[PDB]
Structure formats: structure tokens, C-alpha cells
């Protein structure tokens, strides 16, 4: 017995309550949406953006994937990015990781010979890890795990800022801000891990890796 009845009943009860409380709660976004936020976070069942920020339908457009990864070569994450920045004109991009992230643990501990698609998928985390060996070697398994989480949020903010989409948006004057935040499943709170970035100037100040050199590498050539 798989039977969706309880789910459907809970959905009807929820829809009624919201409309009873505000009669245009739903009808106002019947035929259109204008979110101001894109949120990129982990598929993990404990981390639901609309509910942890207590948001109404129509406020946050959402990519959720194993590990909250952003890569220029993932058309799944990239079309979420292009569609919200180019078509919907969002103003803020939230990259959120969270403690006790299983993707980030697999990234520390799995041997690359491990079978299946998840191990391909988290290659990104291994690479972030490998560049940051000096911050992780010799920590206890637990501290290394937490640290892996933060380091990944920082890498993924950098990847957002370096993406063709965000770079083209900045170059044409479209206001757009990027945010690194992390969530703790055990307390329900979100901490700002990286202050707002609104263009190259902020990025130079706020990120370890050098975004200007990434974009304009050929200036450092003779």
C-alpha cells in the first residue's frame, strides 16, 4: 500500500487555511510569477528554502541538487540560472550549504573507484577539497566535515560569480547580488557566511580566489 490520500488531504487542508487567511494568496500568482530570489541549495530533506525563510508562493525560484553544486557544464543548474536572471530578472542569488551535508562527507571519504552516478556527480567536491588540503588535513573527521561545508559554499559562490550568466548580467548593468549562507539542520538557523557581492569590486574584497584574474587572465601575460 502506497496511497497518496494523507498527502492530498494535508495539501487541501493547507490550501484552505492559507486562502481563508488571505483570499488572494494563490489567485494573485495564478498566471504569472515575479520572484526576486534564486536559491541554490542541497537536495537534503531537512533544508527547504521557502519554509526556513517563511516565504509565500512566488518569492524564491529554487535549484536543489546533491551538494548544492554550480558548474558551467551542468545544464540543469545553468538553465535555472539563465532563466531567472535573463527572463525573470531576479535581483539576489542565494547559495546555501548546510552542516551534516552527506554530499560533503562523501566528497571527503569516498574512494574514486566507487560505482554509480553519485560518485561521478560529487567530483566537484573532491576538487574543492584537493585545493584546500592545508585547511583539512589533520583535523578530526567532524571538524573536517564542517569545514568542507563552508569551503564548498565559498567555491560555489565563486562559481556563481564566474558563470557566463552572472558575468553578462553585470557587464550590461543589471543589478544582481550573490550571497553565501549556511544552514544548521539541528537548530533551524541560517548564518551569513559571505557578505553580499554585487560586482567585481565586492568579489575582489570578499572571496579568497581571485575573480578578476579569472576573468581577465590574459592581462597578466607579456
Amino acid at each position: 500500500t502506497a496511497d497518496l490520500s494523507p498527502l492530498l488531504e494535508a495539501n487541501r487542508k493547507w490550501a484552505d487555511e492559507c486562502a481563508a487567511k488571505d483570499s488572494t494568496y494563490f489567485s494573485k500568482v495564478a498566471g504569472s510569477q515575479a520572484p526576486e530570489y534564486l536559491y541554490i541549495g542541497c537536495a537534503d530533506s531537512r533544508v527547504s528554502p521557502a519554509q526556513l525563510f517563511n516565504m509565500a508562493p512566488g518569492e524564491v525560484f529554487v535549484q536543489r541538487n546533491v551538494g548544492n553544486l554550480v558548474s558551467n557544464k551542468d545544464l540543469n543548474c545553468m538553465s535555472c540560472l539563465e532563466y531567472t536572471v535573463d527572463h525573470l530578472k531576479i535581483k539576489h542569488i542565494l547559495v546555501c550549504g548546510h552542516y551534516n551535508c552527506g554530499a560533503c562527507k562523501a566528497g571527503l571519504v569516498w574512494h574514486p573507484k566507487t560505482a554509480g552516478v553519485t560518485n561521478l556527480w560529487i567530483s566537484d567536491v573532491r576538487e574543492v577539497r584537493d585545493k584546500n588540503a592545508a585547511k583539512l588535513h589533520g583535523l578530526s573527521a567532524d571538524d573536517a566535515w564542517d569545514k568542507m561545508v563552508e569551503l564548498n559554499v565559498e567555491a560555489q559562490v565563486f562559481n556563481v560569480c564566474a558563470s557566463p550568466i552572472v558575468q553578462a548580467a553585470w557587464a550590461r548593468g543589471q543589478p544582481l547580488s550573490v550571497h553565501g549562507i549556511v544552514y544548521t539542520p539541528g537548530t533551524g538557523l541560517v548564518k551569513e557566511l559571505i557578505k553580499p557581492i554585487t560586482g567585481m569590486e565586492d568579489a575582489g574584497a570578499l572571496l579568497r580566489a581571485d575573480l578578476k584574474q579569472h576573468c581577465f587572465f590574459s592581462e597578466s601575460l607579456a
Copy 2:
């Protein structure tokens, strides 16, 4: 203007309110997760699964992408599927489309020459459309849109069922059901489009495309 303060206050208020109603609402989920559902749905800002099924943290692991598309060759969606079926051992997979879906409209109206990554990405939508062109010819814009959304849900339910991850899970007797639902953003309500599929037999009864023929094609060669 780029300040995150409104969001953090909201998150605080939200976390206290939940910790009041229930002492262990967060603490019980601090170091692991045992969700029973995987949800695959559209990235659209109006369709938030934990909110709309009114679920607590830890109940639904989430993939969201533009058009709620499921392909064997997308490692982003596939790793959500593999990690939940193989590692977390979920029992139910929700495939959820929604009326007023911009991805589905784009898959009806855009010309293939359109530049950018969203247009590459929604190629699956054109395939569903083309296979079912007889069902869509001479309907009105708005009716073809609604029909496209529904055909897309059915196609994606087929793709979940046909996936290596689900086929392997069934073949080793892991119990796993797959469901097609559609959400109406204007009313907040979910409607079951496809009754529960728990194995090959259900799929023979419930899907228009032949799953058995797909899996055992060579049985019908001389």
C-alpha cells in the same frame, strides 16, 4: 539594498516559533535524515513541496529543475535518484508538474534557433511534444499548454520507471512506488494524475507507452 537582514529575522522568528510548538522539531533531525519521499518538481517559485504538503524537516528529499524533467543522461537529477533509492532507501517518488509552467510553454512555442542554455535544456519537452503531436494539433494556446503539462508529467513518470536506478531497485525486490501529480498554482491544490505504480505490472496498466516492451524489446526479435 543588497542587505539580507529581513531574511535572517524571518528565519529566526520561524525557528523560535517551531521550537516553541515542539521541543525537538530541529534537534531530532540534527545528525541524520530518514525521508520516505523523493520529490522531483519544477524550479518555478510558486511550487514548494514541503510547504504545499505541509511537511516537517526530514520528510521529502528534493530535486527541482526547469520543467521537472528526468533524463538518464542528466547526472544532477540522476544522483538525486540514486542517492535516495540506494543510500537513503526512500519508498515513494513524487513526479510533480504544474499548470502555468513556463518550461512547457517554451517547449511549445520557441524556435530551436533560440540562443542560450534554457533552450538546450528544454529539448526533452520538445520530444514529448513531438511524440504526442496528434494530441495537440488544433487545440487553443491555453489548452495545448495544459495538455503539454500533463503529457510531460506522464513522460517523466515513464522515465523514472525506466531508469536504471528504479529498474534495479524493483529487480532486487526493494519496495518503491512512483506517482504523477500536478499542482495548480492559482488554488494551491495538487491533483493525482497517475495512480501509484509499484512495479512492472502497475506500469502496464497505467502508462500509455509500453514499459515492458521498452525493457524487453529483444524478446520480440526473431
Copy 3:
């Protein structure tokens, strides 16, 4: 003992002979290339385009993959396509399949539950197969295999013509032709399976699937 010596010696011997015969054979393409052909064919070791067409370096730009597949969502094949049409201004695209293609056999006979990346990868062939059940059911394994090969070449020519790259090139007046050909490893010969396509007009005439309806689907709506 892995030792590249024999390979390197054969390469030196070959380079000498060609330069001895035509002293600018290599030097003329030292610093640049201007191929007129893109070739898309199978990774299979028996099928080398430059050698079967007896071509000099600098003549045919080459994508080779398992099964000779073209999909808008494969950035590997797609960047080969964009780079040669947009940057190098090639004039002709050869899509070549071949008999005794192992990808095309796996596409007939593997069960989708089969582990590993090749089985994900050839999902494209299964889909071509599924649409063409009526041409394949009841044939002997051998005739079905040959037929699968031709059907795949036709699908992939259609995919070339439908790609954003080729569509944008035609729409801006750039001359570009697409060709379906097949090769027989046992005789070293190539047969033209589909006559030249240079735009929509030819495509309407030469391909079973309807390219015009694919591009302009919304014209058939009320």
C-alpha cells in the same frame, strides 16, 4: 612493459615519408586550419574518417563517440558543432554510422537496469528504437541490428538539422550542408544513405520526421 617506442618510430617514419613527398604537407597548417568538413562518427576502432576518405591533415574536423550520437544536451558534441560552424565556417557535416556497431546492438538488447555509464549514454539509441518498433519487431537479430544502424543515422541527421547551431546558421544565410552516410567495416566502403540537405526545403523532402513542424510547432495550434 608498456613502451611507446614502436608507435613513435612509426610516427617518425610516416611524417618523413609525407614531407619527402610534399615538402609543405605539414608546414602549411603549422599555425592554422581551415577544414571544410565536420565529421560525426563512432568511436569504433575500424572507422577512421581521414583515412577512409584518404584526406590530408587540415581537411576534416572530427567528433567520434560511442554510437555517433548528437544531442542538444551533450556539450561535448555540441561544442564541436558550434566551434566548426560559428568559428571555422565549415561547409559540410558528415554524420556517419557503420554496420556492426556495438552501440547500436547494446541499444537493441541491453536491459535498462544494466550498471555503468555506457548504458546511460546509449539511452538515445533506445529512444530511436522505441519510435521505430514497427520496423524492427520480428526481424532476425542480424537484420534488426543493420536496420538499427540506418535508423540511427537518420535520427542523428535530423538532430544535426534541428540543432540550434545549424538552425541559426541557415537562418543567417550561411551555406551549410548535412549528409547521412554509413560505412561497412568488412569492405571499407561508404554508402550515401541520405542525399544532401542544405536547408528546410531539402529536409522536408529527404527526412521521414517533419523538421518544419518541429521548428514551427505553434503554427499548428489554434
Copy 4:
């Protein structure tokens, strides 16, 4: 103008000429293939492996893409790797870059905002570049280009070695070597850049990045 006749005559002439020199040149390869090599190389029209190593049909299975890039998350290249190592049981993997490589130049000079898929695709080249920025600072355009080509070969040899497919093959005692070569289009000559790697021990001796640390990172956690 779109006529294929010149090509078919060339193919004929070519097939007869080979069938004369050797009776069974094609017939011996008509129904199967047992290549000993997999070659991964650039799609560039001047670099044809079977031609340049002067090989007969059936000897080298080929992947070619723009920049000869190897990533765990590209199913196109990965299926070439899995099918050859696991099904065909090849013994040697050639990773081949080439001077004058347009992909490598693009990875030095293009700004990330550049539109289209080639720019997404060559993101791996920017990563190699960035990790090795110290090695490239204040070199001249042309020298940085040559150094980029070489660093790219080494990075891609590392990625082949680090892949799940090769790590699994070694771990079950399958003999498998990996080689880094570079071709000079101006002279037709190949130079060995990296001596043969046949297992973990060779990679410790031959590669600048630490393969063991990459595979066994968690050994160095407290």
C-alpha cells in the same frame, strides 16, 4: 556544390588499393574489433590518430573532443573510457594534446561572459590554467600557449588515472597503462610528454599532483 562524389571516389580508390596490398585488410575486421589502444585527442582537423601512428583498421578506438578534455561528469568521454576498459579490454590509453590548440588559446584569452556552448565546455581549461597560474605569469602569448597545451595534457592524464573506470581496473589487477603525448601539427611528429603509468606507483613518480592523496584523502584525517 553540396555533392559528395569526390569523397566516394576517394573512398573507393582507397578501399581497392588496400584490398590489393592485403587480401584480408577489411574482411578480417568485418564482425568484430580487438583494439589495444584508446586514444583521447583534440577534434582539431590536423590530428588524426590512425593516420599519424600509421595504423590499420581495428587498432585504436577513438574519442575526440575540443581540447582533448577528460572529465568524470562528461558521459560522452566516460562511455568511451568504460566501454574500452570494461568491454573491449584495451591495454593502453593515449592522452594526446597538440601545439597550436585553439581550445587551449581560448582557455587563456576568452572572458567568461562569452556566449555559446564552446565557452561552457572549455571551463576545464580555465581550471587547469588557474591552478597553474604561477607557471604562466609574465610569459609571452605564444609561450603561455605552448605551456597551457602541456599542462593540459598532464591534467587530463591525471583525470584518466583518477577516473572510477581506471581506478577500478587497476584495483582488480587489469593491466592498463596511460600515456601523455603531444603532437606538433607543423611537423607531423609526436613527442612523449609523460612516461608510461601502469599503476599507483608510477603516478606517484610521474605526476605533479598527488594521485594517492586524491584517492586516500581521509587517511590523513584525525
